[PDB]
Short mmCIF file of all heavy atoms in Angstrom, two decimals:
data_model
loop_
_atom_site.label_atom_id
_atom_site.label_comp_id
_atom_site.label_asym_id
_atom_site.label_seq_id
_atom_site.Cartn_x
_atom_site.Cartn_y
_atom_site.Cartn_z
N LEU A 2 -21.21 27.31 42.34
CA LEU A 2 -19.86 27.21 41.81
C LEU A 2 -18.80 27.36 42.89
O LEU A 2 -17.86 26.57 42.96
CB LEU A 2 -19.66 28.27 40.73
CG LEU A 2 -18.23 28.59 40.28
CD1 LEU A 2 -17.58 27.35 39.69
CD2 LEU A 2 -18.22 29.75 39.29
N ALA A 3 -18.95 28.39 43.73
CA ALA A 3 -17.98 28.65 44.77
C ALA A 3 -17.62 27.40 45.58
O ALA A 3 -16.47 27.03 45.81
N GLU A 4 -18.66 26.71 46.02
CA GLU A 4 -18.47 25.56 46.90
C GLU A 4 -18.08 24.31 46.13
O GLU A 4 -17.29 23.51 46.64
CB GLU A 4 -19.75 25.35 47.70
CG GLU A 4 -21.00 25.35 46.87
CD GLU A 4 -21.73 26.65 47.05
OE1 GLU A 4 -21.31 27.70 46.56
OE2 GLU A 4 -22.64 26.71 47.91
N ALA A 5 -18.58 24.15 44.91
CA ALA A 5 -18.09 23.08 44.06
C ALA A 5 -16.55 23.12 43.91
O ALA A 5 -15.82 22.14 44.03
N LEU A 6 -16.07 24.33 43.66
CA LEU A 6 -14.64 24.58 43.52
C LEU A 6 -13.88 24.33 44.81
O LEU A 6 -12.79 23.75 44.80
CB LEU A 6 -14.40 26.03 43.08
CG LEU A 6 -12.97 26.52 42.82
CD1 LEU A 6 -12.23 25.70 41.80
CD2 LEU A 6 -13.02 28.01 42.43
N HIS A 7 -14.43 24.81 45.93
CA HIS A 7 -13.76 24.60 47.21
C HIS A 7 -13.64 23.11 47.51
O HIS A 7 -12.63 22.65 48.05
CB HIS A 7 -14.52 25.32 48.32
CG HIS A 7 -13.79 25.30 49.63
ND1 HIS A 7 -14.29 25.92 50.76
CD2 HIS A 7 -12.59 24.80 49.97
CE1 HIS A 7 -13.44 25.73 51.76
NE2 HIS A 7 -12.40 25.07 51.31
N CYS A 8 -14.68 22.33 47.17
CA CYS A 8 -14.67 20.89 47.39
C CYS A 8 -13.62 20.23 46.53
O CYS A 8 -12.81 19.42 47.00
CB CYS A 8 -16.04 20.30 47.08
SG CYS A 8 -16.28 18.61 47.63
N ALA A 9 -13.65 20.56 45.25
CA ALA A 9 -12.72 20.00 44.30
C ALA A 9 -11.24 20.18 44.69
O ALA A 9 -10.38 19.32 44.54
N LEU A 10 -10.97 21.36 45.24
CA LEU A 10 -9.61 21.74 45.58
C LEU A 10 -9.09 21.06 46.84
O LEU A 10 -7.89 21.07 47.10
CB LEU A 10 -9.54 23.25 45.76
CG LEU A 10 -9.58 24.04 44.46
CD1 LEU A 10 -9.92 25.49 44.75
CD2 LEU A 10 -8.24 23.93 43.74
#
């Protein structure tokens, strides 16, 4: 989740 979010942002 952490990295999915960082990518998305």
Side-chain angles (χ1 to χ4, degrees):
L2 164 61
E4 49 255 72
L6 182 56
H7 188 178
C8 192
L10 286 163

